[PDB]
Structures are given as structure tokens and as C-alpha cells.
Amino acid sequence: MNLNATILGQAIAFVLFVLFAMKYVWPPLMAAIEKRQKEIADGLASAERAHK
Amino acid sequence: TYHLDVVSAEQQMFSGLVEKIQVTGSEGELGIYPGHAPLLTAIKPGMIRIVKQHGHEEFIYLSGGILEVQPGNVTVLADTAIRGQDLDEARAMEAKRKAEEHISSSHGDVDYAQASAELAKAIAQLRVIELTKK
């Protein structure tokens, strides 16, 4: 079919989109989930210490 | 119709005439009906439903045992079994608490051989307690 220089342009485009997601998108996301988990587990700890 | 009997190995759980049932088995839960097959084996932690004349049911906890199936009068031999209003939702929730702790407190295969059974017993209680509300 039409194997084209488009394939190489799109390889560079693939790695560029990977880089954009790698630098800007993904790094800022991790913290929220851990904070929300922490504020639920500490309550179970508090109940245990009340009983103790 | 047909007759059914249940024992908890240190207590009688049921005895009387019955129309149809639903029970657990060697691998999982199973939809049972009368007149289908002639052979029998073991039970995984589960429960049983007893629909009697005029269409009245009851719901029993089965912690483990063996099931006959083949005869007109059938019976369940259970190493431990509890009546559906002797147990309660609070008791099954305590079992849930125990099992969810033991999952965190079991770390090897040898001890998980017991932790898994404890979890299965808790889950069986949690399904029978919901079926009890019908």
C-alpha cells in the first residue's frame, strides 16, 4: 500500500506526544489519590486507639 | 413432594416436607430442583433455601459438609450450620470484619489455608443474611 515518509513524520510525532504527556500531563497527578486514602485510613486508626 | 433434613453435627437444623431448594456445592452455588440426578459429594461454605407447601421458604447457613441429592428424602450433613434467625446481619458483619482483618494478617500459604476458609465462611454468612430478608 502507501508506505510513505508520513510514517517517519508520525514516529517523531508519536515520541513528541509521549514527551508532552511525560513532562506536563502525568507528573502532577499522583498526590491527590494518596491524600484522599490517608484521610480515610487515619480514621480507622483513631477508632482503634479509642477502643484501646 | 419431597422430604429434607439438615444437621449441624451437634444440632438438628431442619426436618420436614419440602417442594424445592437452592444450595452450594463442590465448586460453587447451584440451582437445585427435584427429580434430576442420583449421586453425591461435598460442600463449600454457602447456604440453602427451603420452599415448602403453599410456597413458604427459609434460609439456613451452611459452613461445610456433604449433600445427598439422589434420594426422595434428602439430607445435608454439615460440620457446622446455623439457623437463619439464630444468625443475623450483625453476626455476618462481624464475620466480615474478622475476615477482612485476617486477609491483612495472613501472609503465607500455610496460614492462608485457614484464612481463606474463614473468609469463605464469612462470605457464606453474608449471602445467607441477604437471602434471609425474603
Binding site: - | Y33, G35, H36
Partner: protein, 76 residues
């Protein structure tokens, strides 16, 4: 001439392959229907209803083949 006997041959091919397809499909499907019904004779009507449904699916493609084979034998 040479045209029409080859058209009969092509019709033979489609409609014999469709015969295989439908026959073996219903064979397998009804084999499980009968063993399940032998295990559950009280539920024969229920499983037979299911059997109509999955019969529709199993012969979906086969009936496409068979109809188009009719177009090759009789519609040209």
C-alpha cells in the same frame, strides 16, 4: 455453453458448504441442549426457548449463505 455449468458448480459449492455449516452447528448446539435438558428435565421449556434464540444466531450466517446460494441457482 461453458457458462451455465460453472454457475451450477458455484451454486453447489455455496450450498453444500452451507449444509455443513448449519448441520454441524445445530449438532453441537443441540448436543448441549439435550445434555442440559437431561440434567434439567423440569427446565426443558426454558432451555428450548434459549435454543430458539441461539439457533437464530447459529444459523444467522448459514442462512445468509443459503439465501445467496438460492440467488446463484435460481436468480440468474
Amino acid at each position: 455453453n461453458l457458462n451455465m455449468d460453472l454457475l451450477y458448480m458455484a451454486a453447489a459449492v455455496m450450498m453444500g458448504l452451507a449444509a455443513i455449516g448449519a448441520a454441524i452447528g445445530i449438532g453441537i448446539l443441540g448436543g448441549k441442549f439435550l445434555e442440559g435438558a437431561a440434567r434439567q428435565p423440569d427446565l426443558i421449556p426454558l432451555l428450548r426457548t434459549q435454543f430458539f434464540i441461539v439457533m437464530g444466531l447459529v444459523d444467522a450466517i448459514p442462512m445468509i449463505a443459503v439465501g445467496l446460494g438460492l440467488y446463484v441457482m435460481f436468480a440468474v
